[PDB]
Amino acid sequence: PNLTEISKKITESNAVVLAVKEVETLLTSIDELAKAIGKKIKSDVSLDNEADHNGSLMSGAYLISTLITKKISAIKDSGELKAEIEKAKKCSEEFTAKLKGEHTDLGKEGVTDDNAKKAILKTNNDKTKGADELEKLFESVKNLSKAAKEMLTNSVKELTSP
Amino acid sequence: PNLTEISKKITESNAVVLAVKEVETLLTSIDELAKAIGKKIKSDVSLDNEADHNGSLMSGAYLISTLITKKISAIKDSGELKAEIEKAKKCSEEFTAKLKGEHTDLGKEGVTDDNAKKAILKTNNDKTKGADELEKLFESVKNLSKAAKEMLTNSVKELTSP
Ligand SMILES: [Zn+2]
Numbered sequence: 001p002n003l004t005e006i007s008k009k010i011t012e013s014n015a016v017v018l019a020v021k022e023v024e025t026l027l028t029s030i031d032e033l034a035k036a037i038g039k040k041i042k043s044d045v046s047l048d049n050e051a052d053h054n055g056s057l058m059s060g061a062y063l064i065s066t067l068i069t070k071k072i073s074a075i076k077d078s079g080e081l082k083a084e085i086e087k088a089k090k091c092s093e094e095f096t097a098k099l100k101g102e103h104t105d106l107g108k109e110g111v112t113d114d115n116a117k118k119a120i121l122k123t124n125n126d127k128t129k130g131a132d133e134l135e136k137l138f139e140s141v142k143n144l145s146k147a148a149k150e151m152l153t154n155s156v157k158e159l160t161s162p
Numbered sequence: 163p164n165l166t167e168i169s170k171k172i173t174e175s176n177a178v179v180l181a182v183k184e185v186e187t188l189l190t191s192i193d194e195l196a197k198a199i200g201k202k203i204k205s206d207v208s209l210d211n212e213a214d215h216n217g218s219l220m221s222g223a224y225l226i227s228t229l230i231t232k233k234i235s236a237i238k239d240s241g242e243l244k245a246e247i248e249k250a251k252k253c254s255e256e257f258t259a260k261l262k263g264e265h266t267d268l269g270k271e272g273v274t275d276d277n278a279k280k281a282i283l284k285t286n287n288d289k290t291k292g293a294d295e296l297e298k299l300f301e302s303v304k305n306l307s308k309a310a311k312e313m314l315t316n317s318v319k320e321l322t323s324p
């Protein structure tokens with residue numbers, strides 16, 4: 001086995017996995033934001049209640065959604081992941097577009113807990129203000145991560161293979 | 163060159179860099195939240211102004227700070243990154259604690275843009291409500307990222323060296 005070609009592929013594949021991890025983690029940060037809906041920091045580990053003032057929180061989620069698209073475009077291409085990358089990107093753009101289009105209810109300081117959940121809480125029943133797109137975006141990145149990790153693991157096992 | 167010994171090492175190292183990348187990205191997400199201070203969503207790429215209602219945003223940052231500590235604590239280490247991980251974990255705890263201590267100014271929906279920046283804008287002139295701790299944590303995680311990267315880059319170099 002040519003150690004030169006394998007080491008190169010390992011390095012390249014690992015860079016791809018790390019790039020996808022950034023995207024995956026940003027989605028994770030939004031899920032954490034969702035748990036802060038209708039809450040306020042009290043003097044405890046647990047948060048206190050303060051309903052319907054989720055505007056700044058939603059603005060934060062919105063900026064992260066734009067960063068996500070930029071990170072997806074930062075993944076080094078090679079065709080092998082073209083399909084997965086394109087799907088994740090369009091879904092990330094759809095999510096951001098949905099949040100923008102719902103600015104009537106999401107673009108003000110007084111965003112209600114209920115509307116905030118329809119936008120960023122994937123486990124909400126009503127996902128009509130962005131949550132639906134977020135859920136799909138989660139799946140597309142999940143499929144992208146599996147394919148990426150697959151290329152990495154396969155590149156490494158080439159060292160000991162057969 | 164025990165390829166089976168080097169491969170297991172590369173696999174382990176890849177797992178550490180990935181875990182650290184997750185922590186690093188959560189920090190990036192807080193920096194993105196800082197950019198939403200005093201802003202609201204509108205039908206455009208750029209946010210509009212909506213000053214002094216950053217409470218929900220701060221609660222989101224708070225939950226992410228606790229997630230960061232959990233992620234750091236779950237990283238696998240045999241002692242090579244012993245020091246780096248401990249420092250990062252301690253600084254992450256200090257950041258969360260600082261925010262809790264400022265619950266009076268940060269625990270309400272009407273958090274002023276000025277106080278929000280003292281809490282999560284690491285480049286702010288006044289960093290007395292958490293931003294000082296945030297910057298220390300940011301640097302500590304970068305130190306951890308560098309150390310992890312080197313551990314991985316070296317294990318991979320063993321393929322074409324000596
Ligand atoms: Zn109120």
Ligand SMILES: [Zn+2]
Nearest residue numbers: 109213214215
């Ligand atoms: Zn106001």
Ligand SMILES: [Zn+2]
Nearest residue numbers: 043263265266
């Ligand atoms: Zn107090």
